[PDB]
Amino acid sequence: GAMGPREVTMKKGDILTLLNSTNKDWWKVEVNDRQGFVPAAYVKKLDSGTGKELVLALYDYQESGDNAPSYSPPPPP
């Protein structure tokens, strides 16, 4: 199953609002209607020009219920 009603999953090649990136080992990102803490290693700030806050998903991730990064980020592919 999936913890929490709102689960954020980053898809390789998907854009996710650069949510509170305060964390260094984890960059918060939203997904349409589901947000959560994710490993910055799976994402990376892009370049547009306007000045928005977006981050492409380099790798695939899965978050079950907005949870704080109390542990280290998972190993990428």
Q: How far apart are CA 70 and CA 45, in angstroms?
A: 23
E strand map for 4-70? 15-17, 29-31, 34-36, 43-45, 54-57
* Surface-to-core class of residue 9, CB atoms within 10 Å of its CB (0-12 exposed, 13-18 middle, 19+ buried): middle
Sheet bearing 43-45, strands edge to edge: 15-17, 54-57, 43-45
Identify the burial level of 58 via C-beta atoms within 10 angstroms of its C-beta, where 0-12 means exposed, 13-18 middle and 19 or more buried.
Answer: middle
Q: How many structural domains compose the chain? A: 1
CATH number at residue 24: 2.30.30.40
Domain range for 6 is: 1-77
The technique by which this structure was obtained is: NMR
Q: Which of 33, 24, 40, 43 is nearest to 66 (CA)?
A: 33
Q: Which long-range contacts (CB under 8 A, 24 or more apart) does 40-44 make?
A: 40/73, 41/73, 41/74, 41/76, 42/10, 42/73, 42/74, 42/76, 43/10, 43/16
Asked if 10 and 38 count as a contact pair (C-beta separation under 8 A), the reply is yes
